[PDB]
Amino acid sequence: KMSVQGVQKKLSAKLKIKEGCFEIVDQYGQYILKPQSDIYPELPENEAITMTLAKTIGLEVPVHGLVYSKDNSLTYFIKRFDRIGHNKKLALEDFAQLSGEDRHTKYKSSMEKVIAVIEQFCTFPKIEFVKLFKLTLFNFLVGNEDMHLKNFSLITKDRKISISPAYDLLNSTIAQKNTKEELALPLKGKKNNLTKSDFLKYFAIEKLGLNQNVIDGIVQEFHQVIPKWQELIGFSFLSQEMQEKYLELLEQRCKRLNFFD
Amino acid sequence: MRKAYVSVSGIKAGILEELQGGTYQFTYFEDYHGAPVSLTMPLKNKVYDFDVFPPFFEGLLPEGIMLEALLRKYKIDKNDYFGQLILVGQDVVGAVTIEEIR
Ligand code: NA
């Protein structure tokens, strides 16, 4: 499909420690910089606020932010989690690599197959299932319709294999005009018109094996975070027009899961 | 034809070798007893065969606009996956690096 993230650059960069600024490099960097796209609007500000919303609901999110590039526009940065200390690296593999797909077939999978990758490779699958549930609800609520196989990764850190910290989380729905789907990979065979029972019963109980108390607690976390999400969006660097689109989609997705009833 | 050293955190782990017929082979080193190149390629087995370019190594290549930047910079065929991996192999995602044999 036409992906919003395909038309944006990912530039390697070093943090000049003595100043508070980044130097773009071709190789051997510790940060990624994502400047404006000429194809889709406000992707850096969109990514910066979305990654902050994820952090507010308790997902694992690395250092990220915005900086000014030469042309006065804003550029997003993320601190790489496969780079640590002095020239040390952590193993990191995306789910296309782990399931035998490639860049051309990275949408040719399902949430059920994503679960199976976690069960096969993660040290504590049941713990990562809780994380995947929160992540999938989050992506539905903020309009991230581009969670294909290369946007899930497993990290090896401290001799534990788990789902990596967040990367590339973006409200891609409001960024593009004729959005085709809600989920990049189908769940119960569905990529559009997902319902509360798809997520809370089929996904959370039948496929992830979560207990009803755990499900209920996570849903309550999302209910509780909506006022703070609304506030954070209002204070973001998105334009007023893009803030309104972000808030309107969030409200629609919240209403679809009966948050306000 | 073309072979390449595959290393993990700087330690040589094995050889990615291209065979005739578009097939590929990865072979671990006896001396290597560290973390696997990929979770799909445990040290338990020392040889791995592929009828196409192996998805683990294909997954290190750039995409989208950054692939077009790579093909703007280098005289390389659009589908020479192994050659592109050699070009970017000094620094890719994760702990693995790829260096061509001669
Ligand atoms: Na509009």
Numbering used by the authors:
A (entry chain A): 52 to 312
B (entry chain B): 1 to 34, 35A, 36 to 102
Question: What did the paper state?
Answer:
Here, we perform structural and biochemical characterization of the Legionella pneumophila effector Lpg2370, demonstrating that it is a Ser/Thr kinase. Together with two upstream genes, lpg2370 constitutes the tripartite HipBST TA. Notably, the toxin Lpg2370 (HipTLp) and the antitoxin Lpg2369 (HipSLp) correspond to the C-terminus and N-terminus of HipA from HipBA TA, respectively. Structural analysis reveals that HipSLp binding induces a loop-to-helix shift in the P-loop of HipTLp, leading to the blockage of ATP binding and inhibition of the kinase activity.
The crystal structure of the SeMet-labeled HipTLp–HipSLp complex was determined and refined at 1.89 Å resolution. In the structure of HipTLp–HipSLp complex, a copy of HipTLp and HipSLp each were observed per crystal asymmetric unit. Residues belonging to helices α1 and α2 of HipTLp were not visible in the electron density map, whereas the density of the remaining residues was unambiguous. All 102 residues of HipSLp were successfully built into the model, showing that HipSLp is a small single-domain protein composed of five β-strands and three α-helices. In the structure of HipTLp–HipSLp complex, three α-helices of HipSLp form a helix bundle that sits above the cleft formed by the β-sheet in the N-terminal lobe of HipTLp, whereas the β-strands form a flank region in HipSLp. HipSLp binds the toxin HipTLp via hydrogen bonding in three main interacting regions, which constitute more than 1100 Å2 of total buried surface area. The intermolecular interactions are mainly formed between helices α1, α2 and α1–α2 loop of HipSLp and helix α3 and strand β5 of HipTLp. The HipTLp mutants D133A, R134A, and E144A completely lost their ability to bind HipSLp and the mutants R154A, K157A, K201A exhibited severely reduced HipSLp binding, suggesting that these residues form key interactions with HipSLp. Notably, Ser54 of HipTLp is phosphorylated in the structure of apo pHipTLp but not in the HipTLp–HipSLp complex (please note that HipTLp–HipSLp was co-expressed in E. coli BL21). Moreover, structural comparison suggests that the P-loop of HipTLp, which encircles ATP and is critical for catalytic activities in typical Ser/Thr kinases, underwent a conformational change from loop to helix upon HipSLp binding.
